[PDB]
Amino acid sequence: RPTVRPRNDVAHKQLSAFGEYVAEILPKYVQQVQVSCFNELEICIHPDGVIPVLTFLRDHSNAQFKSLADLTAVDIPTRQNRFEIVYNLLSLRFNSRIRVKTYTDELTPIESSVPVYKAANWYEREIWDMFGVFFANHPDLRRILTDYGFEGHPFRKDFPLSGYVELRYDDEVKRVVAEPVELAQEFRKFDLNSPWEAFPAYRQPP
Template sequence: DICGVDVPTRQYRFEIVYNLLSLRYNSRIRVKTYTDELTPIESICELFKGANWYEREIWDMFGVFFINHPDMRRILTDYGFEGHPFRKDFPLSGYTECRYDDEVKRVVIEPLEMTQEFRKFDLQSPWEQFPNFRSVCRYDDEVKRVVIEPLEMTQEFRKFDLQSPWEQFPNFRSEALPVQEIPLPQTQPPKTDAKEAQKK
């Protein structure tokens, strides 16, 4: 098995991991090598034929090129695809969208159009971000319609600190119980007669 890892903060950002298994010796070995965007790696297809598609996948997803590979081309993405999806700097939405067009009766690739601009949601304090959550919706019989009223709390907000429950709740405190010493029964070895011991 061969896999790739992208760590952009490193000087050699791509880590190629070879997981090798020996059935004869019942042992495993993991070999790691590092490279950047421009430096290729030697292919191991001559040693392990099964590495062919793994190296093509790493080229397709990460953009790491393998020298002396018999068929170095994309294996998962489309022919005209630009970029390498598993790189950390590749956007999650991608650059283009692919769809089937009924008018032209074929698959078309178009620039990506987002339905809304990118927004970063901060949900740390939802009561401040979304004021609608602070109101109550109920049906009023007098006006025969639904009315929205401010939320009334039955009690004020209390912050419970349960880091030290023994201080908060004195009923849970327990005093150290005195240790009771229980005398052990005295056992003595059985008495044997010297004549009986010689017979045995």
């Protein structure tokens, strides 16, 4: 292969050492599942303790991460437990990227990452906005990307793309901008999904 392959695996075995090192501590409180693919590491964490996992990787003699920078969340209705809050972490001294995930349904409150990371509070507001996941012991939980008179949570797959309150008229009332009107133009639902399985090995037995 010359153009077909992106990069050959060489650091994959080196990154697999981290998949053993953190797992050598072996907590049922923390570890659970460790996944490593395409020069990247992924860890999912039990809901009971998220803060003790975040205090780890911060400082530490073996690996120095410090920056718990970017913070995402996954909406998926397949599992019994719905949401999956995903932390993307980066090291400056070590130069590596590790991932921290949560497995809980988190309609019930989850522990905040504000005491460990300063910029985490702004991302925590977005998760409460789009997904509707409350963070316990959080300072200033305020709406950012949502409207001031917005109902529900705008991202959830349970409701349509257009929404319920979206169209804003002016018409009859001199100053009051309208809200209750719900109709919008037709978004064409594409049913484009290819027959036959796309890739081998990814197939799971029923």
